[PDB]
Write a protein that binds this ligand. Structure first.
Ligand SMILES: Cc1ccnc2c1NC(=O)c1cccnc1N2C1CC1
Ligand SMILES: O=c1c(C2CCCC2)c(O)c2cccnc2n1O
Ligand SMILES: [Mn+2]
Ligand SMILES: [Mn+2]
Lengths: 554, 400
């Protein structure tokens, strides 16, 4: 095995730190013999070199099992070695790859051992093979190449390969090479003849730089198993996903189920995970059996049906636009597909995230759009054209009136029920001939006891006592009371900006049951006007509720 | 020779992640950086450099925008209290202020050898197909606050003849820009700017027009109305109640007397006349500057922005909440994000002109939305710090 003739990367220790000096533990005779054999062969290969006892640094070695292997525990050196640039900031998504006629994998034989280590850093990699018991001074070596398990090796190997591939890439610009650890993926649109010939030009270029690669008879055939994917030059899919059929589901089994389904959702449309995830909340040990909820059973059954037949994704054509379509699956659940030619998906996915305690479908849709927009730029370097289950009018109305700024890239309405809509709206002007309710709450923070109530312009009145409450809850409770007892048209005046803010954003779902009870009442109504006044400014009706609800509370 | 630059004690360089870039901006950056590399301004680097600063492309010519916000935080002692550039109080008074991009000057001055590693940046690839192209600066970079701090003495020498010949022209440097103010007639001002450009041209270095003397207060406006309803007065007292938190001496006691007992909102009630003493004299304080509020140079500036609809945006600049140093508005094929970026830039330059620093913005937008879109509409060579907030419901109509 050759050592690459490339330039070395200068390495330093962390500022104010010296090299490791951790002592060697006594080893058994069989382990010592095994290490001696390994180290003399490594020394003849040029990988390591003998040093004297003038070198003060040490890292412990160990021998593990017919054949033996040497383990160098670099924990202490790694702690003292400088930080490096990250090996990668992300991995390619298969959907972003372009279709090739042929693609070949070439693995590098003994990757790290083929690239030299900075001469001035070599002294810190020193290790000692101990003699039988205490007696003799041990045999001392240092590394000449990138050591396995050392902090800098991944980054320095990658950087070395990049420099080696650079000449070849520049004079062969229409051949694509992806670097991954010790593997090289090489694709082109050349005919079967001059592709296999082109691999040989690469293999000879790599061998010239001390990197050996497998020949035609040894190199793997497609599909290639990589990072949980199954890759053809023509199509891609996720690796075989098999959902076990079990009588009893443990936490561990459900965690693994959700993981598989989540992974599958990249190409299998409509995958659902919500009900299965609910089973894992505040859950016990991994061995604990969780009875499947009826909704979880139905979700599992729907997923099995989806995964029944194999599904593949296509590759990316840079000359065509990307199309993203989104559908609502249920409450909080969103699903999407991206294609270039109608219904031949490059990839699929799902969105579920709950941004904030209270929300609506319009906000969730936009959040889904922004998630897909970011994904698209990462994968394809451009935004897709969207097709959304919301009318332009509905979208128009919401964006204009809402306090928050947004921008959705080019999109079209598509009639795929359920359509996104707002379930109620607040009046811009007070209602003529409707009862005006003045509301307020009060809570005692010591006892957590509180009161919620109202007074009206028609002399109506009510107070309800609450037991484990907060200021905010009592204000919502008061508003809920006013809605319950009011009739189809109502004017409601609150001194709670918190309550105002929630309701003005037209939520249709909430983490609070109380807010959900308010939402249910707002939809039943014909007209609702909600106004705000400052608290304790001698405002007529407002002062009347305050005294009423604060009595016995504060 | 190079001037030695060091980080604030106990901390090292920036390790900020490179944001995802579109196809056209990556290609633009590759062309720009290949050219700079050939000219020796930047050099390719190895993996022994663990540092990173984000890079963007903005605009018809593409230009590189390096986001040195983090490096600038970690070098504050250098550019502020070691080689600080003084800010003139006369600039905000001027009839006209012209902004000239002067960043091209910096590439003629070498960067300190031991500091070059902290200027590391990455040009990413689409879909992480290839390793990012890594560089560091060999020269004073654009966007780094240390650059005008170091070039300071060279700029003084450049402007000396022009400043001698034109004593009543204020020239201020902030980052990559030169701010040039005068009280001359517009034609004469523009003639002097052209004159200044010629001086700069002889040194290699090579506009945007402001009128700060016409920057007047944005007063909280109380409605003139004939025939008030119960709802109208409630909205009015609520606006006045909050107005009293910022303005010292706002009264609302007389207006509240009209709202006594539980009355219907649509009931039209006639006003007295005891409230008119409040109403009218409230307008007096509302149109005037806030008494007792002054800029503290040891404190950060904060900017809040509210979306008002119809392409209108209100903003406030303060250091302690309620104590408004400045208020204003921004007005507009323009979308919400585009309008907001334009407003942020407008507020920032005013802030540079008035105080010599940028505010930290509280933006009424989702983080990810802002991050994907802001460079599409960004034109400035600096970048302010920002937060992402939920606009409180009534602050909007109070500043309306
Ligand atoms: C694992 C991997 C990741 C990134 N790109 C690729 C590969 N492997 C492929 O099999 C492949 C498939 C089709 C086209 N590009 C591919 N390649 C490109 C390099 C030829
Ligand atoms: O009674 C109060 C008080 C009082 C308690 C302390 C004195 C004022 C508030 O501050 C307040 C603030 C927002 C909303 N409702 C409120 N209510 O109902
Ligand atoms: Mn209250
Ligand atoms: Mn109260």
């Amino acid at each position: 095995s050759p050592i690459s003739p490339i330039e070395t990367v200068p390495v330093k220790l962390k500022p104010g730190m010296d090299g490791p000096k951790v002592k060697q533990w006594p080893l058994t005779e069989e382990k010592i013999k095994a290490l001696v054999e390994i180290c003399t062969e490594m020394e003849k290969e040029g990988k390591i070199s003998k040093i004297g006892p003038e070198n003060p640094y040490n890292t412990p070695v160990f021998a593990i099992k017919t054949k033996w292997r040497k383990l160098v525990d670099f924990r202490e050196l790694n702690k003292r070695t400088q930080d490096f640039w990250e090996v990668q900031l992300g991995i390619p998504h298969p959907a972003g790859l372009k279709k090739n006629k042929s693609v070949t994998v070439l693995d590098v034989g003994d990757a790290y051992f083929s690239v030299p280590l900075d001469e001035d850093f070599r002294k810190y990699t020193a290790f000692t093979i101990p003699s039988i018991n205490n007696e003799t001074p041990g045999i001392r070596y240092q590394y000449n190449v990138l050591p396995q398990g050392w902090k800098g090796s991944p980054a320095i190997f990658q950087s070395s390969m990049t420099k080696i591939l650079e000449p070849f890439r520049k004079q062969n610009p229409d051949i694509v090479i992806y670097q991954y650890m010790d593997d090289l993926y090489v694709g082109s649109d050349l005919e079967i003849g001059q592709h296999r010939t082109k691999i040989e030009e690469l293999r000879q270029h790599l061998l010239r730089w001390g990197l050996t690669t497998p020949d035609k008879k040894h190199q793997k055939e497609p599909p290639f198993l990589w990072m949980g994917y199954e890759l053809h030059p023509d199509k891609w899919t996720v690796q075989p996903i098999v959902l076990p059929e079990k009588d009893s589901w443990t936490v561990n089994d459900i965690q693994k189920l959700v993981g598989k389904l989540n992974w599958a959702s990249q190409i299998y449309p409509g995958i659902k995970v919500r009900q299965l995830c609910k089973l894992l909340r505040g859950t016990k040990a991994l061995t604990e059996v969780i009875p499947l909820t009826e909704e979880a059973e139905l979700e599992l059954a729907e997923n099995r049906e989806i995964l029944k037949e194999p599904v593949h994704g296509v590759y990316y054509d840079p000359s065509k636009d990307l199309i993203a379509e989104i559908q609502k699956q249920g409450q909080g659940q969103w699903t999407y597909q991206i294609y270039q030619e109608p219904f031949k998906n490059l990839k699929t996915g799902k969105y579920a995230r709950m941004r904030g305690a209270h929300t609506n479908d319009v906000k969730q849709l936009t959040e889904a759009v922004q998630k897909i927009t970011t994904e698209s730029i990462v994968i394809w370097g451009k935004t897709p054209k969207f097709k959304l289950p919301i009318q332009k009018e509905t979208w128009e109305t919401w964006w204009t009136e809402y306090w928050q700024a947004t921008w959705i890239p080019e999109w079209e309405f598509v009639n795929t029920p359920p359509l996104v809509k707002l379930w109620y709206q607040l009046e811009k002007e007070p209602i003529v001939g409707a009862e005006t309710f003045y509301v307020d709450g009060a809570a005692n923070r010591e006892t957590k006891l509180g009161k919620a109530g109202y007074v009206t312009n028609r002399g109506r009145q009510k107070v309800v006592t609450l037991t484990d409450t907060t200021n905010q809850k009592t204000e919502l409770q008061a508003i809920y009371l006013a809605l319950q007892d009011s009739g189809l048209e109502v004017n409601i005046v609150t001194d709670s900006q918190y309550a105002l803010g929630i309701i003005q954003a037209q939520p249709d779902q909430s983490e609070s049951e109380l807010v959900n009870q308010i939402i249910e009442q707002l939809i039943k109504k014909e007209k609702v006007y909600l106004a705000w006044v400052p608290a304790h400014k001698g405002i007529g009706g407002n002062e009347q509720v305050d005294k009423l609800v604060s009595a016995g509370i504060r | 020779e190079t001037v030695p630059v060091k980080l604030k004690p106990g901390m090292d360089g920036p390790k900020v992640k490179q944001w995802p870039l579109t196809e056209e901006k990556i290609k633009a950056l590759v062309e720009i950086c290949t050219e700079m590399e050939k000219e020796g301004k930047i050099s390719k680097i190895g993996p022994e450099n663990p540092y990173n600063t984000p890079v963007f492309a903005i605009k018809t010519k593409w230009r590189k925008l390096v986001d040195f916000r983090e490096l600038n935080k970690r070098t504050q002692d250098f550019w502020e209290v070691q080689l600080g550039i003084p800010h003139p109080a006369g600039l905000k008074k001027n009839k006209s202020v012209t902004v000239l991009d002067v960043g091209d000057a910096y590439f003629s001055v070498p960067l300190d050898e031991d500091f070059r590693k902290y200027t590391a940046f990455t040009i990413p690839s689409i879909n992480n197909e290839t390793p990012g192209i890594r560089y560091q600066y060999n020269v004073l970079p654009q966007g780094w606050k240390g650059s005008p701090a170091i070039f300071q003495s060279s700029m003084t020498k450049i402007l000396e003849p022009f400043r001698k010949q034109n004593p009543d022209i204020v020239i201020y440097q902030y980052m990559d820009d030169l701010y040039v103010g005068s009280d001359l007639e517009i034609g004469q001002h523009r003639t002097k700017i052209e004159e200044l450009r010629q001086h700069l041209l002889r040194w290699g270095l090579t506009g945007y027009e402001l009128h700060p003397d016409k920057w007047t207060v944005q007063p909280i406006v109380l409605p003139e109305k004939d025939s008030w309803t119960v709802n109208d007065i409630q909205k009015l007292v609520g606006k006045l109640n909050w107005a009293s938190q910022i303005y010292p001496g706002i009264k609302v006691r007389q207006l509240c007397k009209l709202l006594r007992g539980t009355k219907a909102l649509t009931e039209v009630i006639p006003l007295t006349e005891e409230a008119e003493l409040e109403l009218a004299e409230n307008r007096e304080i509302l149109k005037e500057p806030v008494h007792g509020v002054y800029y503290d140079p040891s404190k950060d500036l904060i900017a809040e922005i509210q979306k008002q609809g119809q392409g209108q945006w209100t903003y406030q600049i303060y250091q302690e909440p309620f104590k408004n140093l400045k208020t204003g508005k921004y007005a507009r094929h323009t979308n919400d994000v585009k309008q907001l970026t334009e407003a942020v830039q407008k507020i920032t330059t005013e802030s540079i002109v008035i105080w010599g620093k940028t505010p930290k913005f509280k933006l009424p937008i989702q983080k990810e939305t802002w991050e994907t879109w802001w460079t599409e509409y960004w034109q400035a060579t600096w970048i302010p710090e920002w937060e992402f907030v939920n606009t409180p419901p009534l602050v909007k109509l109070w500043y309306q």
